[PDB]
């Protein structure tokens, strides 16, 4: 516990050292980005030692080191919960961030504010580790709002562009709507219990937990962009590609799912909240997958891929399988961060072109980007024994055999099929066919920073799921007895999605004149939720203000 706790805090303290050194302590602005990458890499090593100890004997601690404030009978302290979820999430997030930072060392090379960009990524990571390790709700709130502000500062990185400033402010708006649910839980827990500590909350274990859990579901709804508070995540593509890779994997978007996992001792015994989060997740997973079918921007497609996978995570929460929801957060961070780094590799080669209609014929032109994209796509679509299969496959099996909403289950299976359709869409239009990009060819993926960063995540996208799933201890009873047609449902609908997508893609080549459809325009225009809501809601509010 002396070594476990010391190495648990040095990891957090280490990540803040490049921030403190910005006060001109031996400052070497020559290579600050390299200094930040190294700190993350060493932070990954030290974080893996507590993880081994937990893997070994299940050792876990709370470190309430600093007493900050006492409000009568509410003592507030700086307390870190270094448990199952913290043990396993921190090494994954540090591993993924390490690759994104090395990738950024190349992607953002020409940016004059390269140093400021890396400082923001480090702060964006720090506020996420405050969130995950937090042991009381107030400290959890510090991290919760912390990622929100860094999202704003990184989405609006190119601040001369009005669309970037509009997407940055959109993320804040939708997230602060969710924070109404966060404060509602804080208010309820303080009043009905007498604590913001997770320990005293679980010990008292209220049964009348509808109100605080509706507050947490709302807070998770905005932060992880479930249906209703979802349009901001696609809009967040205005930020630089390295921002989207971090945003969509090892930081902001999973915080909403992480929050509900933290409170599984409460959601366990609330069938009402389980039914709300099942249906909430089920529509999200389908709706966003349907939108991704007709998108043409490569970053938009991956952004909707995230909302669809976050929807599946919310479904897992709602079928009372919080530990499978966590396992999906971990695995998803590997192949999803890679897909963004493969898109950025393509976008960079084609001189900032993000429209797949202007790509094509890249299979041989970019061989290593092609390999990672195919591995990433297969991992996303639950190819057996890749990183994505160890979580998605068990989630679909557990959803099939649960006492579940029937409509939510059907919508979850259709969304799995659609995953195979838009994944094919990226491969077909970006890598296959003849080139459709301009005539001056600057395709060059020969950079060690690009190769090494993608390579490490590629190795993770192959073996991370197997290694993690073989080391974590059992916390449930996995249900392994079940009919063949339920056992193989996830693989079958995935395969029919691939077959059904080849036909659609190939018909684009026939010399026939398309005809727009109501379904096509509905999917292309995102179901019209932005067009109606983002015009009508600002209009009613802004016109109301003057008069």
């Amino acid at each position: 516990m002396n070594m476990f706790s010391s190495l648990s805090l040095v990891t957090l303290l280490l990540l803040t050292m490049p921030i403190m050194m910005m006060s001109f302590n031996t400052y070497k602005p020559s290579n600050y980005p390299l200094y930040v990458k190294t700190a993350i890499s060493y932070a990954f090593i030290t974080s893996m030692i507590p993880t081994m100890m937990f893997i070994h004997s299940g050792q876990e601690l709370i470190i309430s080191n600093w007493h900050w404030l006492t409000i009568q009978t509410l003592k507030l302290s700086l307390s870190f919960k270094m448990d199952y979820f913290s043990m396993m999430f921190i090494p994954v997030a540090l591993f993924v961030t390490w690759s994104i930072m090395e990738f950024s060392m190349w992607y953002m090379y020409s940016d004059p504010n390269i140093n400021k960009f890396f400082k923001y990524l480090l702060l964006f990571l720090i506020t996420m580790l405050i969130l995950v390790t937090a042991n009381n709700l107030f400290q959890l709130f510090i991290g919760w709002e912390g990622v929100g502000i860094m999202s704003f500062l990184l989405i609006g990185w190119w601040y001369g562009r009005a669309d970037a400033n509009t997407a940055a402010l959109q993320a804040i708006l939708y997230n602060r709507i969710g924070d109404i649910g966060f404060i509602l839980a804080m208010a309820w827990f303080l009043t009905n219990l007498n604590t913001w500590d997770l320990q005293q909350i679980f010990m008292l274990n209220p049964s009348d937990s509808n109100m605080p859990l509706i507050g947490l579901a709302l807070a998770a709804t905005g932060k992880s962009a479930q249906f209703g508070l979802h349009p901001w995540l696609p809009s967040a593509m205005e930020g630089p590609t390295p921002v989207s890779a971090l945003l969509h994997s090892s930081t902001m978007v999973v915080a909403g799912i992480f929050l509900l996992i933290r409170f599984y001792p409460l959601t366990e015994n609330n069938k009402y909240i389980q039914s709300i989060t099942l249906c909430l997740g089920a529509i999200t997973t389908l709706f966003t997958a349907m939108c991704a079918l007709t998108q043409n921007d490569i970053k938009k497609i991956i952004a909707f891929s995230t909302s669809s996978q976050l929807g599946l995570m919310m479904v897992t929460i709602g079928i009372n399988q919080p530990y499978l929801a966590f396992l999906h957060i971990c695995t998803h961070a590997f192949f999803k961060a890679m897909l963004f780094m493969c898109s950025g590799s393509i976008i960079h080669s084609l001189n900032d072109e993000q429209d797949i209609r202007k790509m094509g014929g890249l299979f041989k032109a970019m061989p290593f980007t092609t390999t990672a994209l195919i591995v990433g796509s297969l991992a996303l679509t639950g190819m057996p024994f890749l990183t994505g299969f160890y979580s998605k496959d068990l989630i679909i099996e557990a959803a099939n055999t649960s006492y579940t909403n029937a409509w939510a289950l059907l919508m979850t299976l259709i969304a799995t099929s659609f995953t195979a359709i838009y994944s094919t869409r990226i491969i077909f239009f970006a890598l296959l066919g003849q080139p459709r990009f301009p005539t001056l060819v600057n395709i060059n993926e020969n950079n060690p920073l690009l190769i090494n960063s993608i390579k490490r995540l590629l190795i993770g996208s192959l073996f991370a799921g197997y290694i993690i799933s073989n080391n974590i201890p059992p916390t449930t009873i996995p249900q392994m007895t079940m009919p063949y047609y339920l056992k193989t449902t996830a693989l079958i609908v995935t395969i029919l999605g691939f077959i059904l997508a080849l036909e659609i893609s190939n018909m684009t080549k026939n010399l026939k004149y398309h005809y727009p459809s109501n379904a096509f325009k509905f999917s292309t225009l995102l179901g019209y939720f932005p067009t109606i809501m983002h015009r009508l809601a600002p209009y009613m509010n802004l016109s109301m203000s003057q008069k």
Binding site: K364, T439, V441, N444
Partner: peptide, 14 residues
């Protein structure tokens, strides 16, 4: 630049 850009041609690979 150890890879020269090309015009209307397949890029040089390593």
């Amino acid at each position: 630049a150890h890879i020269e850009p090309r015009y209307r041609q397949f890029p040089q690979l390593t």
